């Protein structure tokens, strides 16, 4: 039993809700919140910009030190950093950015990072400003993630379409 509330159950391990991931994280304080990161951990917009703003830029400060030490992530890769005031940990996961020409096949590799964590609050990878089809992202999530994932979908209109078309 966990403290996630109001989710629709899609499969044995995948749950979905119309919610602002920032507000969800502040309420639940989950062990792991997933950020929709880029390889530079430049949290300028989308989910990443919103999560960073909620940390008063502390996420960006930590991220800049991480990059200065380690260099960029790989598309499809991830790193675990602090969750600041939002979660115990933040799993920064890089889905492919379609608006950069990146190979959508890497979306499965990106979701595989979730399997290293027993429970996660997460957005749909590569959705929004990363340019992928969210229906496809949800399908890849369900077919790749085996741990317990709670998906926050900000757009109410998009949430209803994902549920109604879910196979
Ligand atoms: O959910 C999508 C990604 N964007 C966010 N998701 C959750 N919480 C958020 N807070 C700020 C941005 C944001 C992906 C599916 O298409 C709709 C947008
Ligand atoms: Cl977005």
Choice from 153, 157, 158, 165 to test ligand 1 binding pocket (greatest atom count within 8 A of CB): 153
Please name the residue whose Cα sits nearest to atom 14 of ligand 1: 127
CA–CA distance, 111 with 36 (Å, rounded to integer): 11
Ligand 2 centroid to 129 CA: how many Å? 5
Q: Experimental technique used?
A: X-ray
Pick the atom of ligand 1 nearest to 24's CA. Answer: 8
What does DSSP say about strands 14-18 and 8-9: parallel, antiparallel, or unpaired?
antiparallel
Ligand 1: list residues with CB < 6 Å: 20-22, 46-47, 50, 123-124, 127-128, 134, 152-155, 158
Resolution (A): 1.0
Distance of CA 115 to the CA centre of its chain: 13
Map tokens 């190979």 to a residue: 103
Choice from 43, 98, 154, 161 to test ligand 1 binding pocket (greatest atom count within 8 A of CB): 154
- CATH architecture of the domain 8-163 equals 3-Layer(aba) Sandwich (3.40)
Domain ranges of the chain: 8-163
In sequence order, what DSSP letters do the residues of the chain get, joined into one string?
Answer: --S--SPEE-SSSEEEEE--HHHHHHHH--SEEEEEE-TT----SHHHHHHHHHTTTHHHHHHHHHHHHH-PPPTT-EEEEE-TTT-SEEEEEE---GGGT--TTHHHHHHHGGGGSSEEEEPPTT-GGG---HHHHHHHHHHH--SEEEEEE--HHHHHHHHHT--
Choice from 124, 135, 152 to test ligand 1 binding pocket (greatest atom count within 8 A of CB): 124
């Amino acid at each position: 039993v966990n403290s996630f509330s109001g989710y629709l159950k899609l499969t044995d391990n995948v749950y979905i809700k119309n919610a602002d991931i920032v507000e969800e994280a502040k309420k639940v304080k989950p062990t792991v919140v997933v950020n929709a990161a880029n390889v530079y951990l430049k949290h300028g917009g989308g989910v990443a910009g919103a999560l960073n703003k909620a940390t008063n830029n502390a996420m960006q400060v930590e991220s800049d030190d991480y990059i200065a030490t380690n260099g960029p992530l790989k598309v499809g890769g991830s790193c675990v950093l602090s969750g600041h005031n939002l979660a115990k940990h933040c799993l920064h996961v890089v889905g492919p950015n379609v608006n950069k020409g990146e190979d959508i096949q890497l979306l499965k590799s990106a979701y595989e990072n979730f399997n290293q964590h027993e429970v996660l609050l997460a957005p749909l990878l590569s959705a929004g400003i990363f340019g992928a089809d969210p229906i496809h992202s949800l399908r890849v999530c369900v077919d790749t993630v085996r741990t317990n994932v709670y998906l926050a979908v900000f757009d109410k209109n998009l949430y209803d379409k994902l549920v109604s078309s879910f196979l």
